[PDB]
Amino acid sequence: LTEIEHLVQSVCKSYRETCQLRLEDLLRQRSNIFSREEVTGYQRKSMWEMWERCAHHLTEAIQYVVEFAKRLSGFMELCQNDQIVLLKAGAMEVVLVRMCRAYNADNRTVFFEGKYGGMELFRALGCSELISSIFDFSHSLSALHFSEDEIALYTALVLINAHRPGLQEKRKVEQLQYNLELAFHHHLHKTHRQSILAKLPPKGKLRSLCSQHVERLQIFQHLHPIVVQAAFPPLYKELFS
Ligand SMILES: O=C(O)c1ccc(/N=C/c2c(-c3c(Cl)cccc3C(F)(F)F)noc2-c2cc[nH]c2)cc1
Ligand SMILES: CC(C)CCC[C@@H](C)[C@H]1CC[C@H]2[C@@H]3CC=C4C[C@@H](O)CC[C@]4(C)[C@H]3CC[C@]12C
């Protein structure tokens, strides 16, 4: 079988082994919705407690994306500088895409600490506009009904982007990007799903939402810093130190 068919299978496998939550569990858990009393309990928590809970959930989600990246064929053969450039620019963009699997467009809820709740759950953070933008982005993606394999291949391409400023081996990243682009396009053709290509987000949209999100995380980290065991210490030290 072709190099390309093996690449499709290796990306989909890496995604399945690092997807964090199973699509089947997320879909079954949709009727499990926070009560009005439970929502008020979250809204009454301090900004610093809600920050600690959200920062830790986001850090864990990032570490699943680092492991995904480390299993992509060719990623570990890039020099360490380029691994960090791609993960710094891309890992949180991948988390914001992965969110659509945990999002219910019928009631605008996300899976958070065991149940589905609306953006009002997060009232204590004082970030309603940013959180509203994140919910709207997931709402956009949800209308594609991405397959597990589509989201594996799309998120691989979010990370493997030869236009990220600061790459030292831009040609080696182009070669991996071209192969992943061919794998995605090959797979959409094979499954009669080329129709999603015209519906994917404007590329600057993900970058611009993500830059606002990370800027806000960096401000909270500065006021009330959390600490975690780095999966990728060189990357951690770039973001945290
Ligand atoms: O090695 C590891 O395990 C590891 C774990 C997490 C890392 N960064 C996470 C963050 C955060 C963030 C979060 Cl999630 C919570 C609190 C504070 C921050 C802060 F802003 F301070 F960085 N924000 O953006 C990213 C990011 C990562 C890649 N691109 C953007 C980096 C390495
Ligand atoms: C701006 C900062 C301070 C607050 C952000 C609040 C909201 C939007 C955050 C807090 C915790 C986050 C979740 C943490 C973990 C996961 C699992 C991952 O597989 C998909 C994304 C998902 C489901 C995140 C979606 C966004 C999320 C719900």
| Domain boundaries defined on the chain | 1-241
Residues in CB range of 83: below 8 A, 6 or more apart:
69, 75, 76, 232, 234, 235
Residues in CB range of 158: below 8 A, 6 or more apart:
90, 93, 94, 97, 206
Experimental method reported for this structure: X-ray
- In whole angstroms, how far apart are CA 51 and each of 1, 134, 150? 48, 16, 32
Interatomic CA distance for residues 82 and 165, integer angstroms: 10
CA 236 to ligand 1 centroid distance, Å? 7
Interatomic CA distance for residues 12 and 191, integer angstroms: 15
| Resolution of this deposited model, Å | 1.9
Q: Which amino acid is at 81?
A: N
* Sheet containing strand 115-117, strands side by side: 103-104, 109-112, 115-117
> Which 3-state string (H, E, C) describes the chain?
CCHHHHHHHHHHHHHHHHCCCCHHHHHHHHHCECCHHHHHHHHHCCHHHHHHHHHHHHHHHHHHHHHHHHHCCCHHHCCHHHHHHHHHHHHHHHHHHHHHHHEECCCCEEEECCEEECHHHHHHHCCHHHHHHHHHHHHHHHCCCCCHHHHHHHHHHHHCCCCCCCCCCHHHHHHHHHHHHHHHHHHHHHCCCHHHHHHCCCHHHHHHHHHHHHHHHHHHHHHCCCCCCCCCHHHHHHHCC
CA 6 to ligand 2 centroid distance, Å? 32
- In whole angstroms, how far apart are CA 136 and each of 76, 109, 115? 34, 11, 19
Interatomic CA distance for residues 23 and 20, integer angstroms: 10
Which residues are near ligand 1 (CB < 6 Å)? 55, 58-59, 62-63, 87-88, 91-92, 214, 217-218, 221, 226, 230-232, 235-236, 239-240
Interatomic CA distance for residues 149 and 11, integer angstroms: 8
